[PDB]
Amino acid sequence: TDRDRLRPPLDERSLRDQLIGAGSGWRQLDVVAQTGSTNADLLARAASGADIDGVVLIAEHQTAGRGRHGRGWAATARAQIILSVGVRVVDVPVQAWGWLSLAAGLAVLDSVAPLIAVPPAETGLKWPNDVLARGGKLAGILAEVAQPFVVLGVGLNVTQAPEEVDPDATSLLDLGVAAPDRNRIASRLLRELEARIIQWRNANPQLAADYRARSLTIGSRVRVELPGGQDVVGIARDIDDQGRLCLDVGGRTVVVSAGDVVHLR
Numbered sequence: 417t418d419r420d421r422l423r424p425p426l427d428e429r430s431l432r433d434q435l436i437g438a439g440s441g442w443r444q445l446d447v448v449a450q451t452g453s454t455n456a457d458l459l460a461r462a463a464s465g466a467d468i469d470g471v472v473l474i475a476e477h478q479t480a481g482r483g484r485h486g487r488g489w490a491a492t493a494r495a496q497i498i499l500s501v502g503v504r505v506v507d508v509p510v511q512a513w514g515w516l517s518l519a520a521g522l523a524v525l526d527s528v529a530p531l532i533a534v535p536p537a538e539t540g541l542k543w544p545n546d547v548l549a550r551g552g553k554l555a556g557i558l559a560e561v562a563q564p565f566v567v568l569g570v571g572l573n574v575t576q577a578p579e580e581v582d583p584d585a586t587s588l589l590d591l592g593v594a595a596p597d598r599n600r601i602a603s604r605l606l607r608e609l610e611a612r613i614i615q616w617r618n619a620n621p622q623l624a625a626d627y628r629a630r631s632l633t634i635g636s637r638v639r640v641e642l643p644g645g646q647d648v649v650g651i652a653r654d655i656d657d658q659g660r661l662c663l664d665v666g667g668r669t670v671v672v673s674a675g676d677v678v679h680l681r
């Protein structure tokens with residue numbers, strides 16, 4: 417396609433020079449041509465005894481991508497920023513681990529928001545980990561546990577065409593960003609991610625405050641698809657200290673730890 421000409425390879429050396437060294441918490445960065453799932457790969461390293469804290473794995477292409485709740489993640493080569501990072505979480509209370517996921521989505525959103533000329537409606541964060549722009553899914557986040565670590569996975573559509581992955585998908589290119597530089601975006605993303613992880617680790621109140629400011633879900637009428645198939649309709653009001661969605665259901669409070677959110681009119 418013509419989008420191929422808009423997809424130059426990542427510069428691994430440059431990313432390492434920018435993100436590994438004094439002032440940065442990242443300890444290792446690798447760009448692989450192809451893998452099944454970057455999340456699976458880092459989990460596998462951890463399972464074999466590796467210290468994956470601050471370790472970054474980026475894949476140009478991902479052939480067996482994983483979504484939440486056993487779903488899939490589709491990609492074509494060089495069309496996305498596909499990465500996983502390792503985070504040591506054992507030093508943080510387990511009840512707060514849910515916010516690490518929310519922090520990641522916030523980091524992704526902040527890294528790409530200024531690239532758009534004018535931000536269209538419905539641009540922000542859908543609970544739990546959807547980056548939305550113009551109602552389309554720009555990025556998906558997946559957090560998986562492997563003691564003492566959490567592996568955070570980001571799939572960000574840069575030039576990815578919606579017809580290649582999902583009808584509800586969008587990308588930076590489809591938002592009007594003519595020539596997105598994945599090297600620059602990856603660098604900005606990982607710098608934002610480091611900051612949010614540090615905030616999360618120290619229970620910084622600004623994390624929750626910043627999340628609320630970008631939330632498309634809070635204040636909206638929603639249908640929440642719960643694990644198991646049940647649907648609950650209400651109005652989203654807040655996120656609690658565990659990262660759970662608090663719903664107003666006819667005056668009753670329903671707190672959801674996991675589910676798929678659909679924003680209603």
Ligand SMILES: C[C@@]1(O)[C@H](O)[C@@H](COS(=O)(=O)NC(=O)CCCC[C@@H]2SC[C@@H]3NC(=O)N[C@@H]32)O[C@H]1n1cnc2c(N)ncnc21
Pocket residue numbers: 452453454455456478480481482483484485487488489490491498499500545553554555556557558569570571572573576581582584585586
């Ligand atoms: C087909 C779909 O409807 C999927 O069922 C669904 C998955 O949504 S989900 O359950 O909320 N899960 C997520 O969004 C988390 C995805 C995390 C992927 C990252 S990439 C590197 C890392 N390693 C790994 O295997 N997973 C993580 O989004 C759609 N989708 C499928 N690819 C899509 C696309 N590129 N754009 C938009 N929508 C898509």
